[PDB]
Every structure is written in structure tokens, then in C-alpha cells.
Amino acid sequence: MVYSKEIVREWLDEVAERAKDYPEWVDVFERCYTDTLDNTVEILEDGSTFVLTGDIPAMWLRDSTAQLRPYLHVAKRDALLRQTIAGLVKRQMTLVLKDPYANSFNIEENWKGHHETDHTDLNGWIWERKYEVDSLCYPLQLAYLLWKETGETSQFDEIFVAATKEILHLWTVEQDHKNSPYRFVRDTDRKEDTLVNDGFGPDFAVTGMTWSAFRPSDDCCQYSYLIPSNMFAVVVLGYVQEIFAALNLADSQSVIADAKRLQDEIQEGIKNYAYTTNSKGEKIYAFEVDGLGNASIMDDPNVPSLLAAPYLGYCSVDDEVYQATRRTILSSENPYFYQGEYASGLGSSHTFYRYIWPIALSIQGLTTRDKAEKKFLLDQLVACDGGTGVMHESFHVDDPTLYSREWFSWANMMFCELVLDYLDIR
Template identity: 35%
Template sequence: MIGAATLLLSFLLLTGESEASRQDALYRSQQQQSPYRRQACPDYRDYATRLHPPYSTGKYRLPFQRPVKECRLYSSPAVESLIEEMNARINDKDLARLFENCFPNTLDTTVRWHLNADKVADKQSFIVTGDINAQWLRDSTNQLAQYQLLAKDDEALRNLILGAINTQVDFVLRSPYCNAFQPPKASGLAPTSNGQDDTVHPVYDNTVVFECKYEIDSLASFLSLGNQYYNHTGDLSFVGEKWLSAVDNVMALIEEQQVPSFSNTGSVQDQVYTFQRRTSLGTETLNLGGIGNPINHNTSLVRSAFRPSDDAAIMQFFIPGNAMLAVELKRTAEILKKVKQIELANFVRKKGEEIEAGVWKHGVITHPVFGKVFAYEVDGYGSHIIMDDANLPSLLALPVLGFVDVKNQTYQNTRKMVLSREGNPYFLTGTEFKGIGGPHIGITHAWPISLLIEILTTDDDDEILALLAMVLKASPLGLVHESVNVRRVKDYTRSWFAWANSLFAQTILDLARRKPQVLFDVNGGR
């Protein structure tokens, strides 16, 4: 029998320098293939909608959805070895197949460009979200998260993540208010239009920016990418002049977005960021001439014009985003201390602590049924929005973000609230599926992402097994969808959504460490 601890230790011992060097050579050869050979690879937007053999031997007979090796965009020996290990050990063969498809999906299909330069500062990685040919700061950070624990001993993954950090640095330096970006010019990939008519301030270059919705979780995700990488590798090679300048940009933006709508004397204060879109959808634009609803002063919270769903905020003190930002600022401060940037470290840490205090002071309200709970959005005047959205960061995910212990009573009250029809208008239930959705898709579709966060925030084996069963039932293509109709699971949005696939892989790896009995035969066998 192989114990769970041995399995997890093996994650970090699967590859050596020679294998990583061969991976780099393989990647270069793939990129240098003849145009004819590269064009022979199917468009994954179409490929993901079709069933491909061999099928799993479980109840759902899930297809094998990885591209053939010659069409995979990036590969890692450690990732391939871990897939073999998990395939052999996971009892449910449908679950094993879903992991096999999802774990490498970011590498297989979304690494549109990688430059493995000799100097760390020159490495670049452009990671698209899936079926949209643009890189979101939030999505790309989440898409790479499951590879972070392997990066210390896999040079290929280190190079990829370092490149992603550098590419995000460039984006934050160019347009810190924007959320999604075009391919870097050096990639040779053509920019694409989002097809929208936007009036945004600050003005951006649409050959660099795909969309410019200001969301504080985008900036928190930029910080998180470096924080995760350092936490797993101990490598600070990415901390250079440009990264420090990007952190400065983040801090300047935070202070700009802590400015309230009115001064202490009541005069209107100019807002640095405004956004208006010609649209018939209320969630796609900001009211009051593009500034959004007023926010109060003396809260220490940070305004967020949009949510991580890319929907407009109603009350712009978005509590999950502020919670995530507080955590990542404090983690970043520790990196800054390591590189002797003491003054900046102290400023970043203090700002994180101020925002954290603001969340507890203004973001906690008393619900008539559930008691003390976190609100989703507040305005600092006492008004609040009670709901949760499946997109991360969310209230359900506060322990996953590192903001609060899962056993905290306010969190537990909040968890009960957002997982109930009585407390959350976007907790959707039907005859075939249930979970948290959001206004982005509508009130008929729940998001599998929310079920995965449920799993990550419970210790109840029966609850975990029931949630895994629902995710499997809602994944007939062998991939995790963006959203699923709660009455008909075959009615879904996005067959190819790399973020959801990555979160599924992260959830399985968490269970392998935390709840091995749910996945493996821990009492005997191999």
C-alpha cells in the first residue's frame, strides 16, 4: 500500500534537471513545427465539444479529452507522472478520467506563447482563459495554481510560472486598472476585439488591453501569483526592479480607490476610474456617468467597480475582493522584507491590516435568520448586499483565500446562508443539479466551481462524496463547465473553461492530502 503522505511527497520527487531540460527542448520543437503540421491540430474550441475514446470504465464512461501529444502546447514530466500515479490510485475511474483531462488542461491548451529566455527577467508566458483568446490576471493565476506545488523540482513549470509573473508585471505596469489583456507584441499573435463600445478612463491601448473592467481581485491575483510561487519554491528571482514597480502601481491604485465619493465637507470628489459601455445589460456598465453608486469615507476598504464575474458591482466595497487583497498584501510584505525593501514592506503590510480591519468592521452584518455574517457588498453607509456569486473570490471561499479559519463562527454562519435558498438569491436548485450561480449567466444555471469550493471548505466525507458525484454528473464531456442548468445538466455554458478545470484538479489534490479515504483505498491494495 502507498500511503497518502508518500503520495504527496512523490509529487515533489518526480523529475530531475535532465527531464526538465528535455521538456524545454520539446516545447521549442513544438513551436518550430512546420505551419502545415501545426495547422493540422484541431481547434480545441471544437475538439472539446466532441467525445474522444478511450472512455473511462466507470458509470459515466467519460471521454479522453486531451489533445494528441503533438498538439499539446506545453508539457511537464512532473505533471505526466502525477497523472499516472493518480490514475492508478483513484478508486472511481470516472473521477480519475476527469482529473486526467482537467489537471493538464492549462498546459495542453492555453499556453499560447512562452519565451524561455536565459535571464529570469526576460521569460514570458501568455496564458489564455480557454475559448477566449485573452489573458485575465485572475484566471491565469488560478489556472497555474495546481502546478505551483510541483514547481520547486520541475524546471519546466518554474520557467512557465516565472514567465507568467513577468507577463503580468508588464500588464500591471501598462494598465493597472484593466482585467484582461491581448497577446504581447513579441509573441507575434494578433490582438482580438471584444466587440464592445466602451468609454473608459484612464484611456488604454486596445492592442495591449482586451477589456478594462477594474476589479480589485485582478490585482490581488497578480500579487497571489508571485506569493504562491515563492511559498512553494523559496525562489525570489522574480523580484526585480519591474516587479517592484508593479507593486508600487498596485499600491498607488489602492490609495486612489480608497477615495470616497464625497469629502468630509460633502463636496463631490473626482474618481480616477470611470467605465461606460453601450449595452442593454445593466451588469455591463456603471451608472452615474460611469462612476457607480456612492461609497462612504473612513472605511479603509477599497472600491471595486466590477466583480470577479466581470459584472458591475452594486455597492462598490466588494467584501470577498477586499478580504483577498488584505491577505495577499500581507503575504507580499513578507517577500519585500526578504529582499530588504523594508519601507515598502511596512507600507504594504499596514495597508493589508487596514483593509482587513475594514472588512470586519463594515463587512459583517447581523442577518435576521443566520446571525453575524459577511455581506457580499457594502457602501460604508450601512447598506449591504446579501448574496454570493460562484466566481472567486467569493464569501464561500474566504477560508480558501486565507482570510479566515473555516471553523470561525461568522464564516460558518455565512456558509450556511450562501448555501441556502433562504439566504442567497443565487443558490439555485433543480431536479438534476444545485449550487451557487450568479447574474452573469442567469437564474437557471449554477456553477460547478461553487461545488468545488464547498468541498474545499468541509470535512464531512458524505458531503464531499455527494458534491463529487454532482460534478461528475454535470461533466459529460469529461471537462468541467462554466455553468450548468439545474434542471438539465446537458444544458451548459462553455465546454472549454480552463479555470474550472484547474480548480477541479486543485480540489482533487487537496483531497489526496486532506481526505485520502475519499479517493483511495487506504486500507489495502497497491
């Protein structure tokens, strides 16, 4: 029992009626919305919620949050699903305590996943131990949004408090990666899947920002300060201060101060190091910097991205530097911007050349005030599905029957996000 079929069907009817002029949107929305709930979510022995990604049979801290986020609206009516989502926070925080450096986790201590190729400290709960700053943002974001959307507070238990302390500590240690206990080397010929310098990663200076090993694409950072994830960290560090103050949790005074101090330092770090200049001389955000003067000009479709900055709450969609960044990202000045017969959009080091991501099309829609652009991107999302009726990881710009990931629940849910945004559902 993860949700109430009766309440969810009624909410869907209400959505379908709001979107009645777009039957093509509705069919895709319902297929995607139903799939996540019936096929990716399960309640464990201990009453917590394990959420798998889809066609990779493991749980990402990133994916699992984005997967359940659109259910917050109906969770205001469906108290059972509200519990389910509180159980996901509970599972996430428990797994953070298991290993706060891992992106991905198993259903139990079973040693499924990548241990055989991977040289790092491991245990049987870990699917792979690729450290991505945003992996630790997402569970704090889910906890906060569950609280604000529904009023639920049961997720804020001793596990939550301990996991928050772990995150703050790890983020602090990673303000100077020289003190880090984390190393990762994978037996592979694909360099994006391992860390240079015998697992240490590329050179950097201290900036005040917090170091990451890998991106939310699961490919490794070129430079260690990944600006979108540090943007996300600043936001969720605000949530930490709100939750601890509103709820008088254990050690509130010390946690609020530690979180505030880290937030200020990461924010000062962004200010001092995160900006570069485009071909036209405009100030823009860099994607990755090292603090030694290198700064890449690009964006990757995975969230957190530069494109997603207003979506994650870091800045206003109206911000001048964001807008200049956006124009640079959605142009050939970005080496990952691809243009074909069916669509133009964002590819990734992680996917085949010429393949662009539905997640970034959705985010592009979510980060413009322009309703005609939202409607265009929705129509294109539906038209570039290879006749499947669901969202893929990536599809060829010249032929969307060429795609990756048959079953990618996170991407299905980002399509849902944009439809809800279009119908003014928030």
C-alpha cells in the same frame, strides 16, 4: 517547451494510483490537467508566459493565476514548468504596469477585444478594462505561492517591484474613489456590463476598504466595497510584507510599511462595515457594502467569494461567522442559490437563471472538513458535465447538458484543486 512530459506523466500516474478507486475522477482530472498545459499556455519572444482563459481568446490576471496554481505541486519536480510559472508572474506584472485597472489583456499590442464599445482610457494591450480588485490580488498570490511551494525567486524582479508599488498606490487612491482617474461606460443594453452615474459607479462613503468597479464575474458591483475581494487584498498585502522583508528588494522599508498601513485600514474597514445579520439574527458577512448602510446578503460563485474566504487564507473554515455566512449562502436566503433535480448550488447575475457553477461546487468542497461532502461534490461535478468530461461555467440544475462555456480552463482547474484536496495533496 513549457513543461517536461516525462515528469508530468509520472506525477499523474502517482495521482491516478492515489485515486484508483475513482476512475471517473481520474479521467476528468487528466483531461482537465492536460488541456491547460497544452492548449492555454504559451512562451512569448521575451521568455514570459501568456495564458489564455479557454474559449475567450485573451488573458485574465484572475484566470491565469488559478489556471497555473495546481501545477505548483509538480513544479517542485519539473524545473522547466517552475520557470514557466515564473514567466507567468513576469507577464502578469508587466501587464499590470501596462494598465493596473484592466482585468484582461491581449497577447501583444493588437487592439483585440472591446475597445469599440468602451469609453475609458485604453491602449492596445487591453482586452477590456473592467476594474476588479481581485485582478491585482491574484498576481501577488501567484508570486507568493510560487515562492513558498518551490523556492523560486526569479519572479521577484524590477517589474515585480514596480507593479507592487502600482497596486499599493491604486488600492490607496481607491480608498476614496472621488479621487479616482478611472471611469468606465460601455455601449450596451445590459446594465451589469457598465457603471452607473456616467462611469463613476454607485454612491459610497469612505470606509477604509478599497473600491471596485466589477466583480470576478465581470458584472458590475451593486455596492462598491466588495467584501471577498477586500478579504483577498488583506491576505495578499501580508504576502507583500513577507516577500519584501525576506528578499531585501528595492525600497523594502517603504513598501512593507505602506502595505502594512493599507492592510490595517482595509481590515479595520471590514470590521466596521462588512457585517450584517441573517433572517435568524446571526452575524454574517455581507457580499457588498457602500459604507452608507447598505449591505447585500448573497454570494457569487466566482472567486474571491464569501464561500472561498478560508480557501484564500482570510479566515479559518471553523470560524463561527464564516460558518453562519456559509449556511446563509448555501440556502434560499441567498437569491443566487438554485435547486434542481441534478444539483443545488450557486448561480450568478452573469449566467442564465437556474444555472449553477462548478467553480462554486469545487470551492464548497474545498471549504468543508467533511470528506463525505468533498466526495459528494466531486461525484456531482463529474455527473453534471453534460457528457463532455470537462468543467463548464454554469449548467442548468434540472439538465446539465444545458450549460455555458464549452472550454473554461479556470473551472477545469478548480475541479483539479478539489481532487488534490481529497487525496491530501498539498
